[PDB]
């Protein structure tokens, strides 16, 4: 929370960083980005979507039952 210097304690850890003018802007943005987005999609839709298909069923069923209540008359 404070400034740098007195936060943690690390022993021997080596970090390499390349220059930004040295390397490309988008490293393989259409050969790894598509498998990464399909992987992150496949690892989340089974936990996100089965409530939303229930919401879609509730919306359609409520529309159909309101039309059921009003389309006899």
């Amino acid at each position: 929370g404070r400034q740098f210097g007195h936060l943690t304690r690390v022993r021997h850890v080596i970090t390499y960083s390349l220059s930004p003018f040295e390397q490309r802007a988008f490293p393989h943005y259409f050969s790894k980005g598509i498998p990464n987005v399909l992987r992150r999609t496949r690892a989340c839709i089974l936990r996100v979507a089965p409530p939303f298909v229930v919401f879609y069923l509730v919306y359609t069923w409520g529309t159909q039952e309101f039309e059921k209540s009003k389309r006899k008359n």
């Binding site: 943690t8 690390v10 022993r11 850890v13 990464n36 992987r39 992150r40």
Partner: protein, 100 residues
């Protein structure tokens, strides 16, 4: 018993064996857990901060490790639990001494 099968499937699908973390790299830190982290040998503590820094790196790039380096459930070297039990026992003993 099949509840161990639930635990193995859960440790597979829980998402913290993906990033190369073991069981006690994801513990939430109140005062007790901060004390139990400070009570560690040096080699385990350096391995711990290294695995934590790799996890933050891999979640920064949102890339998850290859198949040959996932942490496996059979070799679950959970280590932080005895020190954390000792912290909880001494804390509850101090609380009971204050209550009576």
């Amino acid at each position: 018993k099949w509840l161990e099968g639930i635990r193995k499937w859960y440790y597979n699908a829980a998402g913290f064996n993906k990033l190369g973390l073991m069981r006690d790299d994801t513990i939430h830190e109140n005062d007790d857990v901060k004390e139990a982290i400070r009570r560690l040998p040096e080699n385990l503590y350096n391995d711990r901060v290294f695995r934590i820094k790799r996890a933050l790196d891999l979640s920064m790039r949102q890339q998850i490790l290859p198949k040959e380096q996932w942490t496996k459930y059979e070799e679950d070297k959970f280590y932080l639990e005895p020190y954390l039990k000792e912290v909880i026992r001494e804390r509850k003993e101090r609380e009971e001494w204050t209550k009576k």
